[PDB]
Each structure stands twice: as C-alpha cells, then as structure tokens.
Design a protein around this nucleic acid. Structure first.
Lengths: 116, 124, 141
RNA sequence: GUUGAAACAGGGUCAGCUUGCCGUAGGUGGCAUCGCCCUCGUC
DNA sequence: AGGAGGGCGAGGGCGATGCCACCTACGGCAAGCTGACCCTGAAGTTCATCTGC
DNA sequence: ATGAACTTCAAAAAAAAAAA
DNA sequence: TTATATTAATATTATATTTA
C-alpha cells in the first residue's frame, strides 16, 4: 500500500509530465510531500488531475496506455492509506522510482499494455 | 483487483463512474471530453453534483451504444454498483475521496479485462 | 509531517532570489499519541543522592504539570494524562515492576481505528490485588 | 577435582527553538427537440 | 322489468447527451547549532601495607 | 611484600566516481 | 536522462391483488 502508491504517483507524474512537457510544478513538486506520507490527503486529488492529464496527452493512445498502467497499479491498491508508515514511504519512494524508470524504459509501458 | 461488494460509497461511486465513462467511451469512442475529463473532479468529491446529471446522461449513452446488448451489459453492472449506493453522498469522505479514484480504476480495469463484464453478467 | 512555509529567508541563500524569500521547511506533528512512560524511583539510589520525599513530590508535580508548562511550536499541545504510582512497602520491590505496569493497561477505545484524543483511549487500572502491601496512588488518572 | 578463572556500557543528555502555501485565476463561449403523426374505423 | 356501458390498437419513430481548450503558474523544503562529554593504557615504579623475623 | 596509586611513557590519523 | 500512441465492446427480466 506504499509501493503501489509510489508507482501510482510515478505514473501520475509521468502522465502530467507527458501531458505538460515543461511543467514548473509537477505533481511531484506540488503533491509529493503528502502523497508519500499521507496518501488519502493527496491521491484523492491527484487522480482528479489525472483525467485532465490523460485528456491532454497528444497521443490519445499513450493516454490509454498510461491510464491502463495506472489501472494496473491501482488494482494492487484497495484503499489509499490515511498515513503511510515509515516502512512504506520508503516503498513509495522506491515504488515511485521503480515505476518512473519503468515508464522511461524503452518500450516497457507500450509492451506491458500490449500483453493485455 | 475489484471488490464488487465493497459497499464503500466512495468505491462504489468510483466503480459507477468508471462504468459511466465506459459507456460514454463506448457510446462514441471518439470523444474529446469524456465524463472523466469533465465530471470526474466533482464525481470524486461531490457525487450529488454530477451523478444526478451523469444519469440524465446515461440512458442516452446506452442508446448510442452500437451493440444494443452491450448496453444491457453495462447497465446491468451500473445496477450492480448502485445496489451498493443507497445514496449519492453529498460530499465524498476523504477516505471515500480516494476510494472513488480506486473505484474508477478498479472498475475500469474490470471493464477492460476482456471477458469480465460479459462473463459476470452471464452469471446473473 | 506538515510542510510549513516561511515567508522570510534566513540567510543570503543560494536561492534567496528576486521575487520572494522563502524557507518552507517542515513542522512534523503527531495528530495524537498517548505515550506511556514507565518510571522507577529506586530507594537505593535515593540513598546516595539524597532524593527526598520532598524531592519526590516535586517530581510527581513535575510529571503531572510539566507539559502544561513546556510548550512549543514544535510540540504544540501535550498533556499528562495520568500518573499511577506504585509505592512498595519495602525499599526492595513488593512485586515485579512489570507486573505493576501491565496492571495499568491502556487500550484504544472499543472501536476507534485511529486515536484522536485521550477520549479515544481507556486507561483501566487494576487495583484489585496490589493490596498485598503495595499502594497504587493515582496522581493524574 | 590441578588447569582462564573475575570482568557493565556504564552513569545521562528535550532536537530543540519556529517558519503563510502561498498570493489568484470566467468554465467558459453556444447550441431548435426537433422535423410530424385521422382516434380512429362503427354500433 | 332487462337492457348493454367497449371492442381494438396503436402509445414512438430518430438522431443527437456534445464540441473545444485549459487542470496550471511560481518559488521556497530550509536555517543553525551539536554528532558529544568522562574514563578505561603499557610499563614501570612507588608506596603503603604485611609477613615474617 | 604485594597491589593500588601513580608516573612516566607518546605526541595520531584523514578519502571519495566522470566518459571515451 | 529516459519516453511519447487505444484495453474493452452483442439482452438482465417477463403470467391476476381486490371484490358482502
């Protein structure tokens, strides 16, 4: 519940940075301090930014892929926790970096999407 | 990863919105602003605001669905969701705030998993 | 772990730049925590330090009232929620200490999933069998 | 009962002191429910 | 008095329930201090003490 | 005389990526 | 630093209460 929300934040910020290439306040710089440690405070509102970010993706298929993987990420999530234990904010960070270097992998999301 | 019997009003509304947008995005797949793009912000927070209008708006999507039985498929799971929704809550609780996004993406997965809805409907 | 902001930079920062001077920072807070300190006032070292019964009532007052007086932006509001002292008849121990500390069992209230106040805890003492010769004197609870 | 013995991590020390998440921003602009349909045939 | 109190079948047909963009800007996430006291040594002699004389 | 107390001894010691 | 294009998509149910 910390690692998968780290992944969720990674895909959310990737979608944002994919939607707005040049951002001054990515949802990292704006929502990370509380998505890492306090997921209900944020992930209930990151994911209202999310449909708009997916809408703004110039490749709507890329929006579908990123929304697919955030569905996959969030399938492992049954509820955003009120507070992330110190154990999981490390997971969140690890989950964030794992998923963000998965997204910035060569064809990883295109592939993983295509095997569904 | 979908608790079809969760009863968490945020989660059931997220599921409901997921199927609502599934219908909208199967009504006309070429759609500039799906209800995620125009309604989700409050559907996740103020379900009474939209979810009334989302279901003014729903039978017309069910009509626009090309496969007339697919409309029954999706309306059936709207009803399956709404059994768990005794009321659209005025403001979604913060737990429920997040569980709405959970529901949107859980039910969206359930809809985009290949046979799930067509199967699960046939066990009803 | 609240990210507070300061609307004044401290030093001439690497970024104390044109528009605003800001040093955001962190004000971590516990939304509520019922901390259970256990304490041992041993007669044997009260003999070498001259810890008097007066110096002990001062410590009881201190424990009861020391958060009402030691306040800060950092810690906000802390309160002494109860001081159950087990005074043993001997300078030895009448009973094992932990037998007396499990005796004061503090459990979150029946069905509170997250605790917001002392009202969401239940401090049940067990003064039923300590009367062996011991005294449970309840100073805060 | 002739052969490594004995042996403390001690004693104790507030992470404090404190710090706006901010200033603020239209959901807009607008769009026909339409085109039309014997209540009939008759006792 | 004894009447008969409608019989029939239609009650939508059609399409549309959106289009468009935007979902941010900006900057700051630190400052400042401390991060330890104290000892505990080998090696040798002295010096106080003990035993034996 | 044995064993603590004491008195000398000696005078620190220091780092850390590329990428051909 | 990198990366950057669409999953899923075909019908639930369906036979008369009340009438001193």
């Amino acid at each position: 519940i910390g690692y998968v929300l780290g992944r969720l934040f990674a895909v959310l910020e990737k979608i944002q940075a994919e939607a707005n290439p040049g951002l001054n306040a990515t949802i990292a710089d704006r929502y990370f301090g509380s998505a890492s440690s306090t997921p209900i405070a944020v992930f209930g509102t990151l994911m209202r930014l999310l449909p708009h970010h997916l809408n703004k993706l110039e490749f709507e298929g890329r929006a579908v892929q990123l929304q697919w993987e955030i569905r996959q990420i969030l399938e492992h999530c049954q509820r955003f926790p009120n507070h992330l234990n110190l154990e999981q904010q490390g997971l969140f960070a690890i989950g964030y970096y794992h998923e963000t270097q998965f997204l910035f992998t060569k064809d990883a999301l295109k592939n993983l999407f295509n095997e569904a | 990863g979908l608790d079809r019997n969760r009863q968490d009003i945020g989660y059931v509304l997220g599921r409901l919105f997921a199927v609502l947008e599934k219908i909208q995005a199967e009504a006309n797949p070429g759609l500039n602003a799906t209800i995620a793009d125009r309604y989700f912000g409050s559907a996740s927070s103020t379900p009474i605001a939209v979810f009334g209008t989302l279901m003014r708006l729903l039978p017309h999507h069910l009509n626009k669905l090309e496969f007339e039985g697919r409309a029954v498929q999706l309306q059936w799971e709207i009803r399956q969701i709404l059994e768990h929704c005794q009321r659209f809550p005025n403001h979604l609780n913060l737990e429920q705030q997040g569980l709405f996004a959970i529901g949107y993406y859980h039910e969206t997965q359930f809809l985009f998993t290949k046979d799930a809805l067509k199967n699960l409907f046939n066990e009803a | 772990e609240h990210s507070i902001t300061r609307m004044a930079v401290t030093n001439e920062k690497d970024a104390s730049e044109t528009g605003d001077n800001r040093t955001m920072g962190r004000k971590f807070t516990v939304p509520y925590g019922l901390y259970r300190c256990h304490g041992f006032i041993s007669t044997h070292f009260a003999k070498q330090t001259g810890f008097s019964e007066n110096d002990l009532e001062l410590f009881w007052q201190a424990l009861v009232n020391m958060f009402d007086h030691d306040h800060s932006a950092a810690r906000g509001q802390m309160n002494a929620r109860g001081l159950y002292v087990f005074e043993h008849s001997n300078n030895l121990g009448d009973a094992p200490a932990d037998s007396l500390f499990k005796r004061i069992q503090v459990v979150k209230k029946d069905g509170v999933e997250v605790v917001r106040s002392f009202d969401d805890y239940l401090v049940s003492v067990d003064d039923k069998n300590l009367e062996e010769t011991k005294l449970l004197r309840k100073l805060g609870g």
